[PDB]
Design a protein around this nucleic acid. Structure first.
Lengths: 95, 155
RNA sequence: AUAGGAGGGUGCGGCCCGAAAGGAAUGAGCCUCCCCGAAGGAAACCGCGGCGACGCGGGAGUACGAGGGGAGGGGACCGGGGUUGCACCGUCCGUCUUGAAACACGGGGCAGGGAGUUCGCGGCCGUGGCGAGGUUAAGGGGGUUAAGCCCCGUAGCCGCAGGGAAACCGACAUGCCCGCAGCCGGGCCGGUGAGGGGCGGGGUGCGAAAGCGCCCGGAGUCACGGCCGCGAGA
RNA sequence: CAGGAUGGCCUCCCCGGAGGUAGGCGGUGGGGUAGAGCACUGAUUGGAGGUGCAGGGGGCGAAAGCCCCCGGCCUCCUGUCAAACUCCGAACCCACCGCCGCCGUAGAUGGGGGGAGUAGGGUGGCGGUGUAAGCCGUCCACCGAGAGGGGAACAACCCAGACCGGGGUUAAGGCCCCAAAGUGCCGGCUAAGUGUUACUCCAAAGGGUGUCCCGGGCCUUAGACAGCGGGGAGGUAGGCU
RNA sequence: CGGCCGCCGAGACCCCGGCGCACGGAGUGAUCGGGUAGGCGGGCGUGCCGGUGGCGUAGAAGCCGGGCCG
RNA sequence: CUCAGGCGGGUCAGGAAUCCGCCGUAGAGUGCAAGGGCAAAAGCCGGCCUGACUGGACCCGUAACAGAGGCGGGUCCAGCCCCGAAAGGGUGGCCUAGCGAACCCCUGUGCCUCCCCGGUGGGGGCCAGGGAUGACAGAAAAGCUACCCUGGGGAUAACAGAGUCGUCUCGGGCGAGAGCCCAUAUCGACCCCGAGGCUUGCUACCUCGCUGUCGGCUCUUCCCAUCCUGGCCCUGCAGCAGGGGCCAAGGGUGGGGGUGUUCACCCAUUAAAGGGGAACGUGAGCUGGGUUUAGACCGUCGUGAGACAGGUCGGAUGCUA
RNA sequence: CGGCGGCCAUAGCGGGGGGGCCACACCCGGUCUCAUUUCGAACCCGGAAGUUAAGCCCCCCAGCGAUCCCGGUUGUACUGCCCUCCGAGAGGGGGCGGGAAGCCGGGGACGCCGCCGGCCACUAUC
């Protein structure tokens, strides 16, 4: 933009307490997320390769389906309907 | 449950838009519109943000009957009365008031009657204005059951 | 000729006249009575409270109230015009400007002149004709004093098949599921559902291959008027 | 760059069609700003006790020689505080679901089309810069394009959003006169003409036995609080000079 | 300065009728009424043409002044 | 297979590489800014291997919402390999910087196509890859105008004002310190707080269909933080004479020499030879000396035209109220 | 006893006991399949005679750490909202709606839970 391409308003947003740092439990990487399910998308910075723009943080979508290892989630970022592909690492179940 | 009377001190000007929309759901539109609201946790939360903007306080049944009679109309100037109420749905102004107490019939539901009572100005001056809270000497916010007193002066 | 100005506006007085077109003499301004009566709402005096200011009860939603109706009295102006006093309010007009009463710009005054027009093309719209077709141009014949209108002329354009650089190839007169309008049955609900939406399959191009692109279950054509762009001096 | 175009945005028309969620609450998500601190990444102020050592002074000299010592180089319980630090962290903002509220079939929610306009200002909050005024972000009632009554008048401060005429009552604000309405009431403060000014109008640190009001100390016939009547010894000139 | 009480005082707010707009067919509206840029829609007037129907020396248009309506 | 670093022991000049144990949650390392991530790893080692692959999508950034090309990455599947026991991984370098239109040309590969018709030559074209615009969503590019001209602009500089008060001027508080001794007869640092609009500067509010500059001259008003005169207090006041403080604008506060000069320097007088505001008072009152145009020379610089807070000569002051 | 997980320190440190431990370790042979740019140490083929002593399992003790709570500081610091409410134009305060860290004191906490086998067992010893 002039100071955006994947990073801006980050450092401290991707930073955690030393207790929440260390690569996280294995269970969440393995975790499957069904289609028709409502998911919170939360940025996990422990895993580089496949991580949301910070603008996306805290959005809640419905899993529209899957491509490969990742899942394809339809989310509403603002008014606009968008679909975001992300790994199971960056999804948590709603309830 | 209990029913409360809410009156809008400061109108459709000198309001922020968040507060002005909050006010709209309550069924207030101008200065000197009054409405009867039941205690419900959503409604109560609303009334609390809005407080400085409004004069609020708990209203009784007896004062409600008085209020329904004189100020009420659908058309023109026309006092509500037992015969008029009879054609309405009920048989009596009191039964209408007691159903409002139960919370089962709102003002609007009760047909050929407005959810707003268009009252007169107060009488006399004010002795701590209205730009400062009831507690400091004004009238703003929750205020006993002393809303009964104000509407009597307003007739 | 002792009193203040964007020259006035609104209300109410003075003075001034008013034949006509106005309303009214079949009753005008005007006056009086009776009643209904919105919002509103006293007084005298009394009682009881309050340091007192003053509140409270009763008087009382009464007296009173805009406005309206009816009846009555009187008998010629009233409206309206000219000008002016008083109370109240009032820093032109147009433009420029974030802000103009302006020390921003422009104006002596009045009259006359004085600025969104035409053509082509494209995109819209409304109306109207006809319909899987529609529409004729040029021309001469014709008719007429001339001419328009009337008839002939279908040259030619557009649509009825699209994709593709071209070679070149070439499709659903709707099979499945929702549901608006509407219809139907029951007592809001349950069907049937054109239009419509959602699938499937097909035609073509790229392609070892897979995967995508466009297209596909018959509506257009012409006329009139208007709206706007762009091209023109516009 | 004192200019266009394309959105956002404004209007008109048309099409499809039932919910929509600005509002508020709970549930399920995101977070390091106010604040706060020594637990890191971190910059550093200060004295101790170590004498662990690079060395500028000394010693049994063999000038820091085996061994201790002193600028000192860096541990240790401590010591200042931190946009770009954190052992931590509100109020609050926002996503989503349900509810409730409200809005909607005279068409919301959304789509396509035609026609535009495309110098800003401004009070407050939160700021960044700069002594400042000024400039620039962000949210904002509002002015711009919106009157009216009040703030003496005063684009944006207050009340208020305005079809025509009539009647009534209040609001902002005021009640000595000009000017509507109080030569108001109780009590404390005042003696400066302070003030009578929310304001755009209205000058400070310091200091006054100037006042009034609260505090605990000393101390009360064990009555010096000041006066006054009597007081101010002897050793002794303390010694030195 | 701290209490307290009675009043004054807006196109606000209230109230009666009228008027437009919106909606209702071949009365209803607490939830309608400020307005620049700009969009949308309706009417009036002006010259001449055509069609239709009238007027004029028994006094046209124009001019001047006054009345009346929207 | 797990680290800088520390601790003790060995080796060396301490030390390092190197060795042995103990401590050690990440301070190490990951090419390179910064930040974040990470310990059976992305860090370390050994072996093997060259997918930094072809093709076509998907998505986001680009350009939040919300239009917006090119370009980048991530993520899929198809194909071919690679490694691994397989699962599984690899669309280069842990992630985020290291890129480029329209057009034109050339490469690689096959076919399509070239005007009555064929053969041949030579052309044109589809796709993909590579090539610049670095002023980077992409003109083809050096200067002067005081000889200038016009449209505009107070959206914007010069004068003045307004705003502002850092700078400037002036005041108050505290009192280190010397004055033989004694802070205040006198002098007075460090620091801290106000006032004024008089210097300088900032502001871009007001004017570009003009609000003419500075200085002098003449003529006048006002202010005091007062130079003198009046009335007063102290003193390190003997007198004579100073020094310091208080009231006070009633009056006075001059003439000469240089500078265009406001200001400033100088002479002798004087009771004293005070300052500041008023369109930096006073040009519809004068003057026009200075800022200063079109003419010219010199110094400096420039290829040159030509320039100068360098010097210098000469260069209109309208109007009947 | 074992094996496979979930929450992922409430299962950290320290110390204590036992084994209801062929089977899990130590331990012993290394010829062979096989690990060492040096060593069967490591990896792997082979065995259990010996040791329960670790480990490992089970039980317990909180002094340290971490998790959570109560009270004190504190409804204080801080804040959303409004004011012709106050100040010379900054701004602040009150109401109203909320309310943190650091620290002190007083505590729970040295696991829980899911599946499957197994000497012993047919259960829970562990």
């Amino acid at each position: 933009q002039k100071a955006h391409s994947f990073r801006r308003k980050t450092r401290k947003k991707l930073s955690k307490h030393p207790r929440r740092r260390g690569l996280p439990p294995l269970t969440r990487f393995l975790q499957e997320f069904e289609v028709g399910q409502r998911v919170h998308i939360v940025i996990e910075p422990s895993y580089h390769k496949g991580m949301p723009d910070p603008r996306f943080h805290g959005r809640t979508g419905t899993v529209v389906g899957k491509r490969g290892e990742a899942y394809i989630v339809e989310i509403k970022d603002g008014s606009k309907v968008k679909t975001l592909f992300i790994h199971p690492v960056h999804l948590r179940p709603q309830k | 449950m209990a029913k409360l009377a809410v009156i809008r001190i400061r109108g459709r000007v000198n309001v922020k838009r968040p507060v002005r929309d909050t006010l709209a759901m309550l069924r207030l539109h101008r200065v000197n519109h009054c409405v009867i609201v039941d205690d419900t946790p959503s409604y109560l939360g609303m009334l609390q943000k809005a407080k400085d903007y409004i004069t609020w306080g708990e209203i009784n049944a007896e004062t409600l009957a008085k209020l329904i009679r004189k100020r009420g109309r659908l058309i023109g100037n026309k006092p509500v009365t037992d015969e008029y109420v009879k054609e309405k749905l009920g048989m009596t102004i009191e039964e209408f008031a007691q159903k409002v107490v139960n919370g089962e019939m709102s003002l609007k539901d009760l047909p050929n009657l407005k959810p707003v009572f268009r009252l007169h100005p107060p009488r006399g001056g004010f002795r701590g204005s209205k730009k400062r809270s009831f507690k400091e000497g004004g009238a703003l916010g929750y205020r006993g059951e002393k809303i009964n007193e104000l509407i009597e002066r307003m007739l």
